[PDB]
């Protein structure tokens, strides 16, 4: 019942998890290269650890959330022994090919591994907001689902045994994720010029931001399918509009690099043919590599 | 009451219904006239020329390619327009809405800068949402009628036209920012023999999911310090590599993320490595 758990790496993200556990019964031991950065967790009742092995030792579940698989690897190895016998959940961010590669390493060292992908932000962690995708040893997944739920109680979730995907998806969403932050921060810079509090702006954004997810679902079909007979609008429209946006930004006296880029693609896609086609067609351009 | 609309673009046609399927009897016309049928079959009123079309309603709605087009229409019907009231929904900049605004008042033609946020289907539904800007007086008069098209959120700003349009711009960028990430993302899982059909749902999940946290930034921007909570630039920075690294590895267009990084790189270079992705804004204040 709320069993123990050990988490490694105390980034903004690192620390957020610990609480979910701590602030979910699960007694949590924690360890981090530089240390110091803890108090609140310890104050909130955590256990700082002598060394890594000590930290590992002290729990059946080992969560690792750090910079990069490079880091990960050069932790594990030193405790590789101690890990066998315990399940390793890697939430460090990494590519398909990285997840896949680290998956193998553990199995070859007889360590049950899970490659989890976080879709939540420090705050969100522990809430019905947060959502994770894990992939790996279904046995292990089933085995600790409970404790795992602590962080994404709404959607602690598992995909088949191939790790690649969990991570792959992770990438996909990222980028989408940035795609927004950008448009928004840009849009905001825009209304910035008009002495408009983002506080003001955002709401309506988010209003329209919710509005779009609609059309997206419709587009998927077009890609899944083929002909990009347009429903929304032609590329050529979108294309022009980007100019305007660019034109706007420039006029306003703020970075215009973003939209101008957006156009170049439109331009390409158009150049490539499908000017009449829905923005769907853009996909064909992404299927097409850039080096 | 009656209503008249101009332009049978993708957008043009969509609206008709909202009107038609909202009482408003609609006598419209089109640049490339020779289309309606289904509309006319669904029971429209097709006028002959522009003035004819203007004549035939107290409210007149124009949605065409671009303010360039718009402008070179007005004159011909400029007579018929006085008395009626036109709401420009042709896609156009602040400074274009501004110019259209001026010209109108200077000919006592009542104008509104209106911003459509919906997709053909969505039009007329509690989904659709419109942002207008113009004369308080005018708003009251057809608020109810106006609601017909965006029954959830037919909505009005200060008197400035610029803004309605401005906002419009702000979003579309956001809007593209998505379509891209998605289409790219989709190409990504493409490689893994993954139907977009499959992918999209979760996209849309995350598509809804983020707008939340974004708002948490607004204060930081409105404020100053970008003390990070979420994640430092430097994190995002690394992640973008991976994404880029991913795409490349997988054998698909990589130019996009490679860009993302450069900015990250800049922002970092420009100090705020520790700061939330918020800080990126400061790079937008810096012109191209
Ligand atoms: N922040 C978020 O919102 C968020 C969301 C989803 C996913 N993530 C993922 O979570 C991970 C970290 O995010 P974060 O913001 O918590 O990162 P962070 O603030 O940079 O923390 C990462 C941790 O990695 C440790 N570390 C890794 N390799 C090390 C090494 N070789 N030597 C010493 N310390 C090492 C760092 O310890 P020292 O620096 O003290 O040595 C630090 O505690 C990343 O993989 C990221 O993709 C973050």
Author numbering:
A (entry chain A): 7 to 297
B (entry chain B): 9 to 296
Sentences from the study reporting this entry:
The structure was determined to a resolution of 2.77 Å, with two molecules, A and B, in the asymmetric unit comprising one dimer. Two active sites are formed at the interfaces of the N‐terminal domain of one monomer and the C‐terminal bundle of the other through reciprocal domain sharing. However, the density within monomer A and the C‐terminal bundle of B was good, permitting the building of side chains and NADP+ molecule within the active site at the interface of the domains. Superimposition of the HRED1.1 structure with that of wild‐type IR361 revealed the consequences of the mutations. The substitution of I for F in position 127 at the bottom of the active site as presented in Figure 3a has, counterintuitively, made more space in the active site through the displacement of the side chain of (B)Y221. Mutation of M125 to W at the top of the active site has again created more space, despite being a larger residue as it projects upward and makes a new stabilizing interaction with the side chain of D176 through the N‐atom on the indole ring. Further stabilization of this conformation may be provided by a stacking interaction between the indole and the mutated 179 position from L to V, which lies on the interdomain helix on the other side of the active site cavity. (B)H250L is situated at the interface between the N‐terminal domain of one monomer and the C‐terminal bundle of its neighbor and may provide stabilizing hydrophobic interactions in a mode that has been observed for other IREDs in engineering studies.
